[PDB]
Amino acid sequence: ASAYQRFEPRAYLRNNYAPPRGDLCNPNGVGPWALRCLAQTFATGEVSGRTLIDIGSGPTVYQLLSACSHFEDITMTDFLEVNRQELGRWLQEEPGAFNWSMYSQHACLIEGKGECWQDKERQLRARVKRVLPIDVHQPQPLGAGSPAPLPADALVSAFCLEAVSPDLASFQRALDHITTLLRPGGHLLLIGALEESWYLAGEARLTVVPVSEEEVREALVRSGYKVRDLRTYIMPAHLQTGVDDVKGVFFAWAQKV
Numbered sequence: 001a002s003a004y005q006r007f008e009p010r011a012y013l014r015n016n017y018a019p020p021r022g023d024l025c026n027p028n029g030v031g032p033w034a035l036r037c038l039a040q041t042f043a044t045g046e047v048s049g050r051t052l053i054d055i056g057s058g059p060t061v062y063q064l065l066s067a068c069s070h071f072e073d074i075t076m077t078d079f080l081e082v083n084r085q086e087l088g089r090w091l092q093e094e095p096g097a098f099n100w101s102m103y104s105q106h107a108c109l110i111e112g113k114g115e116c117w118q119d120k121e122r123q124l125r126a127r128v129k130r131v132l133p134i135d136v137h138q139p140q141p142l143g144a145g146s147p148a149p150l151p152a153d154a155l156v157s158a159f160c161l162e163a164v165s166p167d168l169a170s171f172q173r174a175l176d177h178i179t180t181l182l183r184p185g186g187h188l189l190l191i192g193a194l195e196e197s198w199y200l201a202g203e204a205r206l207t208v209v210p211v212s213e214e215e216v217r218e219a220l221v222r223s224g225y226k227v228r229d230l231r232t233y234i235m236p237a238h239l240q241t242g243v244d245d246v247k248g249v250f251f252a253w254a255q256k257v
């Protein structure tokens, strides 16, 4: 976790959300695939509620585009204040925010409700009430009296756990830790890197725990969920760029029972 002090948000984004991994024009891309998982899961209108919490938001919002139209109270979090910062920048259309419009549009495109994308970036910005600091290794990630509405009706996390835990055991605990935040019967949308062990972010060189679809599932069950849906996307050769060594990406729709 010490390494996370050299984390460069602008380089993280550059490494992962700007072409090639960021080109949403090719259907076979990982961008389209991920946004599609989210779209379809929420489209089933089974993941509803008043509040929602996004764990380890980092400096990204794509993970919330389809969600934002289902929960009025959205809470975004992250360790690094540097990330909580970059988030704010886009939340207040401040100077030099990252441009997510291409992602916004591909959410609207995929959702097919004919929504204009400026309208989606509006609904999101509006529904995100707070950007809180968080530590998944803590038995109570947020803190004691967090401004966050608990328990949340739903959880969303992307590439967090496997990137902050040094091994499967650390990973499982971290999972159980955030699971506490989820109301019983609420939903979890977990995205992540399969069999990855490192990834760059400017100066920083972060360790990752290579995990598998079975390890991730077995661990989801172990944490107390009833695995609703679990998909795997194999990273094509053209999306390997030495910013990391990821093999594929996983999507999980879990339900705390």
Ligand SMILES: Nc1ncnc2c1ncn2[C@@H]1O[C@H](CSCC[C@H](N)C(=O)O)[C@@H](O)[C@H]1O
Binding pocket: 001, 004, 007, 055, 056, 057, 058, 059, 060, 063, 078, 079, 080, 083, 134, 135, 136, 137, 157, 158, 159, 160, 163, 164
């Ligand atoms: N102890 C901890 N608890 C929670 N998040 C942590 C953490 N230590 C580091 N992080 C954050 O976990 C993130 C991993 S990168 C993932 C960013 C974003 N979720 C995306 O979808 O791309 C970083 O933003 C990092 O700051």
Ligand SMILES: O=S(=O)(c1ccc2c(c1)CN[C@@H](CF)C2)N1CCSCC1
Binding pocket: 016, 017, 021, 022, 030, 031, 034, 062, 159, 162, 163, 193, 196, 198, 199, 208, 244, 246, 249
């Ligand atoms: O699969 S991605 O290319 C992606 C997105 C983010 C990350 C990785 C990969 C791998 N390293 C993670 C840190 F360990 C961060 N994709 C980028 C476009 S939006 C959906 C996610």
